[PDB]
Design a protein around this ligand. Structure first.
Ligand SMILES: [Mg+2]
Lengths: 242, 243, 195, 242, 242, 242, 242, 49, 48, 49, 49
């Protein structure tokens, strides 16, 4: 079959990198993280449940502020995610330092693609195992995905991780180009409940967002989260009825 | 594990336990895994059949498969029956996740072990006893219950153990009474049960070499040396450079 | 007609072909008749190489049986009926329907599915006085039907050890822990290496 | 097979790093450590039982003051501990050198994870197979585990090391967030005692803590330790009558 | 066969690294050394019997000056000891440069433990297959062993090399913490006798000591050692009768 | 074995460095070289034999001047030996630079052990496949052997090379600790006559020495060689009839 | 055998090195080059055979110039020789820089052979697979054979290349240390004619030589090769009849 | 060579190459050959004549 | 060699004579060697 | 074991032409054919082709 | 069995083994022999009975 995941200096006979495809299958071995773009904002939801109930609600807790207008969630190794996220935060302030220009959502994702590609090409190190959803409103709403290798693809709703496939299939039916902030927030809560095959409770996810009208990050508060659980769960019950 | 189910199928009404389809022996092989299998066979008055693991696989297979079928047929024709299966590594072992040439053979013999174990109805009773080098060269696909319900760690014999095996043999020997079974055991440190047995055969040779019918303590100590004792097992080397 | 089909495929070449020829042929004589070909994983070929002697030897066996199935020789009211564990190991000739008109996915048991398998087997035992098959199903989801049988089998044997000779809820659950270790372990902590 | 396991750069067809997975099991081989958080501070209980009577019972120490107000336990190799902790000590002070302010319990624990993350991505090295528990109070009490992988998970009570499995089951029922400092201390030695499945003696275990009315690491002498170990021993007895 | 010892960078699935457990075996094949602690200083006692009479009778050495108040003994390759002892001597003396205080037994041990562990992590260099004994009186008499792993273990009495297992069991019976200086030197001279299964002649043992009162390292002259050795011979002969 | 012998980094489960034993068989590929120590001086006797007669034997020599009272001999690669000993020449000279005082025979041995040790440790480089016999008089006569890794054994009659085993047997019997410098010269030619397995011609041998009284290097010219060889031949022939 | 020939850092169990043996087979593969030393000079001859006529009739260069009185000639890898002699040339210039005196052939040979040995040390760098016969007159004539192994050997007459073995057996009978300058070159021409087993023309040899009486290398034209070539051709004819 | 699962089937194949159209004439065959791929077939069946 | 001689004699026949001259042989020798198991034809650019 | 070892190669230009002639002969008139053009198209093609 | 070969040999193997067993739990007729190989064949004389 192969033995070309043994290197990362190689290509296989089909011209593929299987190392990168198992760093892809490290993402799928992490708990999901979902993004939604609406035309009123962009909203990033990511799992915040981990382990037994003996771990804080606030154990990761993925949706890190990167900048004032950019939040980025993760799926994959919680160890590699941290370093990347810290590198994402540094690159955005370097842009501020050298321009006084808050970094574009697009150009931030680009600089991340290039950073992870140094670690793909070099054989004395490995590629990351992590996929990030880089999201914000630079001056229009944007949601991108940076891959294990660092491939840039633009999405209007996505997910990454174990929950990924179901939630893709769901959007293929429900997701509409006419979508609004309230609907979106509800929508991603429904989508998270299919992944976990079970109801949601308020603190077992964290949600970050960048509005157009504010053009600044605000974290969704647990109490503000609460009315959204109640409405989302309506549809959740219906879709977990077999 | 095996015995009490086979002679008493009242158990499959009083408890309602559905028949065991396998038991696996591990720890060191050659201890007397074969002997344990016979010991059971005697107790249920069953048909013992021994299959060596070198009867399975060649290098493109057919005759390997043919004989799994053969002995499955004899056992059904001769029920109750106990098939001793030394040594799982040439018909049950780990798979490759990315192919190799050699594996293919091994797999094709294998699927037929996996099938038949589940295949028997209580119309014909085929109980089996496995044995292996360790369980850590074995796939978990056969270590599923109803393929191998439980496992028995058969280790090496204990100090006190070696004494009781020595005693089986001392019986046979004429004019034995200077034998210290404990000292003989001490010397035969890290010896299997089979080893104990070999020494006894050889005490009789040593004795007749000295032209006597009496087999006590010189003879036995000399025997130990011939078979068991030939080793120092971790010493070596003092430098030069490792000093 | 129950055949384990991997059991064939002789290294005395074409003896292999003969055996499948005769079983098929017999199917027309005793028609209507069901032939069950177990694991098409070694009686079904693949045209991509892995054993020079092996691919061609299976192939002869494979295209012979296909010949009898509807190659030119009539179905004979057969009614194959045939089991396999792999799909990507198959030749295009068999993979298609019209030699197996309805390709069926047989997945691992659902929540309801655990319950059903559970009932059939606990009737062979001594039941429980604390019965709930839904409670057992929550842990065992993501296992297979053979592990359901496995649990049952362990509970009855457990009862012997306990000196009860009676199976109950407490033995059923203990049987789940022991069985699930061997062969389908399900909760395992992924929040350690991964997020 | 299985693996694909003799490189650190290789992700296997599972999508795990086998190398890294072998090293979480090297933590387990090292002696148990028990971490417990309450609202009055954070208690860390650590096994200092090694050897028969060839070795001295005091064996350093094993509950190292890392900073002023942060202490840590180790589980895994002692050799692995020395080097991770050397670096850890330096980092705690490094924050004070460049800011002249407290190091955060969150932040110390991330950069202890980072040192080994470096040794997980890179191909020339292995991570240390060691898991430190990072316990302190900068301004609220916190307990984390650092993982040989480099994962950072906030716990509320936990164990790692030999006792990892044992103590989770124990703490499903016993651990509560309305517990007292004194109750926590005692409950943590019962947990450890369970780990070793034996009677305690106060001479071969060391308990230290960071309170929230102190904000300083402290350590509880063996003369003091005696009554806490003694009320522990009754509860080990109840458990070892079952 | 394994390949879980192809490099030092491959863990075993059991969670251990095999290659340092074989560097542990490197010490055993070399000859014995015993470090024996009393409450009035420390004694250090080491093989010098080595080979036949082609080799010089007073062959240099197992008993090295570190300082004029801290001494060390080794077991394993006396290549890996010789450069390591060069490294040790510098290390104590750097402490003396920058503190104008002598290195404490504990602190020198910690630095050797880091040093060893440096080689252990990189695949490009092997760690020493040597263990070291560090004996002093800083102002508390102290005895340690530093492992080839670069792990630190405190000892009441310790041994390494060929005779490691005999000396342990022997001191399990006889040794006390209240042995006199005279008793503790002599006690370990029986044990040393047992280690080579022969009477002790004063030309095949080199013995140094650090006293608490002086805090100065001194080496026992051949014939000044002779009466201590003579009293040991009675017990060693006795015990070789069995 | 058959894998843990394919690098200088691996140990075996017997804890042998087989690459270093193999570098040592390299020593045994080379011709015999013999040292004697006596209390009136030290002797270096090198084989200077040529295997074809179109060879010019002035450079088949072992004996290298190092310091003006330190000579040394070599066995192993010819290549390895010249670079190594050139290092030793520099090292002896450097010692005089920073102290103004010729180098001690011991210190030079420790320095050149340590040079070989970095090359044993670092995996990126092979060890020097050579042993030295370092012979000098510093104030008191000295004879050392260095092993390929850098281990140090002080001798009193020694050899390295092909004939080593037999020369070891010879000095077991013959070498006494009261032999005069003259007497021991002949005895060392009888040891060389034995190992080469015929009587010697002065063209196939070279002698160099350091005596205590003169405290200089000289080199023995073929005129000044003969009276000694003539005595030696008589007995070399007698041991060929045993 | 296996695994003892796929790297340069590994020895065999016998102290042989099969990689380095194969570099000696590399010397043996190429064309013969003969060096013959006499008391009036040193004559260096190399075969200027071409395996086609399309090849230039003076092929650059079978005899290289290093200094004004130093030349060398090649057998084995011709690629390598270009590099290798550039180093030799710079080394003789470097000594004229730092001492104002040309380099002695002995010390030059050591330097070149050392550069070789340096390329033996490293695991990623293979050694030069070429032997050079460095010839010159410094005070008395000198001839050295430099091997791919880094070892130097001085000769009275020598050969290298595929004709090496034949010309040792030949000159062993025939060479005497009492040839004149003319008698020396003629005997060397006979040796070249034997090796190739055809007669000589001035077009399949390049000769230079070094005079004591001039202390300089001079390079022999095809015209003035003609007298020597005719005289020599008679002896060759008689040797290729038997 | 040195197989029996892909040696023996090749010496009955060599017979075929060579019987189907070979030495012997003609007749009225006209042999209808049928196959699923031409990518693992001998080049003699593949070619015309 | 038995083949070279038969090939040569057939050359002689081609030229319609029975005298097996040097030239019938040279043509023959080249025909038989051209077929056979291997004769030199590669000698490297890094070797002679 | 033969002596006369004959390689049968693919057809050459002139080689194809001789064959076409035989078949045309059996196959009546075809005089608007250029035999040379047929060979250029069928370059290196077998006799059975 | 492949009909003629296998069955004759099967019969002569069984006929060999039963006798030699049956007259020697102990010396009476001592059986000696040799083989050049035994790794090449199914256990029979490798059977410890
Ligand atoms: Mg089945």
């Amino acid at each position: 079959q192969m033995g070309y995941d043994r290197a990362i200096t190689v290509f296989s006979p089909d011209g593929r990198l299987f190392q990168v495809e198992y760093a892809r299958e490290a993402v799928k071995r992490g708990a999901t993280a979902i993004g939604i773009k609406c035309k009123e904002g962009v909203i990033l939801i990511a799992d915040k449940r981990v382990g037994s109930k003996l771990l804080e609600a606030d154990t990761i807790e993925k949706i890190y502020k990167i900048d004032e207008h950019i939040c980025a969630a993760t799926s994959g190794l919680v160890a590699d995610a941290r370093v990347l996220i810290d590198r994402a935060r540094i690159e955005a302030q370097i842009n501020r330092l050298t321009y006084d220009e808050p970094i574009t959502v697009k150009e931030l994702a680009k600089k991340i693609c290039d950073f992870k590609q140094q670690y793909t090409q070099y054989g004395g190190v490995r590629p990351f195992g992590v996929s990030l959803l880089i999201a914000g409103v630079d001056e229009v709403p944007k949601l991108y995905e940076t891959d294990p290798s660092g491939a840039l693809l633009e999405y209007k709703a996505t997910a990454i991780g174990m929950g990924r496939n179901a939630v893709t299939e769901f959007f293929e039916k429900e997701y509409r180009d006419d979508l609004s902030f309230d609907d979106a927030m509800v929508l991603g809560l429904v989508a998270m409940g299919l992944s976990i095959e079970s109801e949601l409770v308020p603190e077992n996810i964290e949600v970050g967002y960048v509005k157009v009208d504010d053009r600044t990050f605000k974290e969704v508060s647990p109490e503000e989260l609460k009315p959204y659980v109640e409405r989302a769960n309506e549809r959740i019950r219906e879709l977990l009825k077999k | 594990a095996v015995e009490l189910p086979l002679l008493k199928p009242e158990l499959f009404a009083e408890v309602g336990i559905e028949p065991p389809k396998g038991v696996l022996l591990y720890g060191p092989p050659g201890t007397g895994k074969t002997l344990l299998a016979k010991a059971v066979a005697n107790q249920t008055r069953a048909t013992f059949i021994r299959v060596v693991g070198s009867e399975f696989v060649q290098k493109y297979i057919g005759e390997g498969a043919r004989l799994v079928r053969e002995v499955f047929q004899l056992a059904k024709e001769k029920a109750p029956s106990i098939i001793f299966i030394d040594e799982l590594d040439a018909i049950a072992a780990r798979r490759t996740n990315s192919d190799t040439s050699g594996d293919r053979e091994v797999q094709r013999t294998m699927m037929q072990l996996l099938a038949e174990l589940d295949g028997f109805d209580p119309r014909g009773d085929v109980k089996v006893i496995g044995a292996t080098n360790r369980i850590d060269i074995l796939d978990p696909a056969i270590l599923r219950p109803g393929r191998f319900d439980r496992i028995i760690e058969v280790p090496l014999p204990t100090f006190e153990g070696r004494i009781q095996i020595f005693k089986i043999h001392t019986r046979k020997m004429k004019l034995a009474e200077d034998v210290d079974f404990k000292e003989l055991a001490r010397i035969t440190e890290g010896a299997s049960g089979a080893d104990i047995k070999a020494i006894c055969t050889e005490a009789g040779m040593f004795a007749i070499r000295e032209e006597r019918a009496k087999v006590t303590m010189l003879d036995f100590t000399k025997a130990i040396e011939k078979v068991l004792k030939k080793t120092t097992p971790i010493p070596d080397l003092k430098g030069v450079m490792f000093v």
